[PDB]
């Protein structure tokens, strides 16, 4: 509204669409690096605590599985990031 106070506070000008900055991209999953990550995955295996999570999930005790995963990593977002990845591996193995 061209106003100093409000949810759209500030001046009103003609807004310009900024060109895409390449450093914003990092974190993207290229097909080639995804393929290489697949190869190392099938050639290296999984860490010992991953194997315990497989056993925990195959036993269907998900609460303890996420609790110990958070204890191993340190953050809930990392624990969730693990869980979806190893369950995703689970149906692939099945």
């Amino acid at each position: 509204p061209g106003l100093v106070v409000g949810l759209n506070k500030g001046k009103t000008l003609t807004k310009r669409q900024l060109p895409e900055r390449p450093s914003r991209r990092k974190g993207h999953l290229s097909k080639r690096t995804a393929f290489v990550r697949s190869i190392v995955r099938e050639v290296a295996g999984f860490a010992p605590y991953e194997r315990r999570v497989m056993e925990l999930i195959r036993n269907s005790q998900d609460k303890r599985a996420r609790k110990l995963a958070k204890k191993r990593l340190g953050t809930l977002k990392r624990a969730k990031g693990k869980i979806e990845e190893l369950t995703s591996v689970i149906q692939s193995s099945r």
């Binding site: 106070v5 409000g6 949810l7 506070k9 003609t14 807004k15 310009r16 060109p19």
Partner: protein, 180 residues
């Protein structure tokens, strides 16, 4: 530990000689580069205009000069700054345009003005940028006639409403999401 300033006139003289030596060394070109017009990033100083570090890639491309040759002819380039409004865009664009219009480029190898150069270059003279490109301030509004709908418009009554809307924005934000 004390820091005394008995070398203040000495420092001032040394800086002036360094400027003088710089001018003598690179006399054909101005001793200060072109700088873009840039607005300070705060509510206390957003009403002013000062000299930024350098132009952006979008401004350089819109003006028609490439980012590679821009450094060579003396146009500093900032790769971090971005233009979020056309008002700043054509503002810096017209700064470059007037710079280029007043700019003369000596041909290299002194054989012919290959594409972008100057045919006659005997009129060389060292002049500061500020004279040709005097950075200005925000345009001060001149007198305008009385607006009738603005006259009916109260003023801070609105600022009270959008304020109350802002403070209790989460209050109704909850209200809709919980009832929906």
């Amino acid at each position: 530990y004390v820091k005394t300033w008995f070398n203040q006139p000495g420092r001032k003289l040394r800086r002036r000689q360094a400027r003088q030596t710089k001018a003598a060394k690179i006399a054909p070109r101005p001793v200060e580069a072109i700088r873009p017009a840039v607005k300070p990033p705060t509510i206390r100083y957003n009403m002013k205009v000062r000299a930024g570090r350098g132009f952006t890639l979008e401004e350089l491309k819109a003006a028609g000069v490439s980012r590679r040759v821009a450094s060579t002819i003396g146009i500093p380039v900032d790769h971090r700054r971005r233009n979020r409004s056309e008002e700043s865009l054509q503002r810096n664009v017209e700064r470059i345009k007037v710079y280029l219009a007043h700019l003369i480029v000596f041909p290299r190898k002194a054989g012919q003005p290959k594409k972008g150069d100057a045919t006659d270059v005997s009129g060389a003279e060292q002049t500061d940028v500020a004279a040709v490109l005097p950075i200005t301030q925000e345009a001060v509004e001149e007198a305008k006639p009385i607006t009738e709908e603005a006259k009916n418009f109260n003023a801070f009554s609105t600022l009270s409403n959008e304020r109350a809307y802002a403070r209790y924005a989460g209050a109704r934000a909850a209200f809709q999401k919980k009832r929906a």
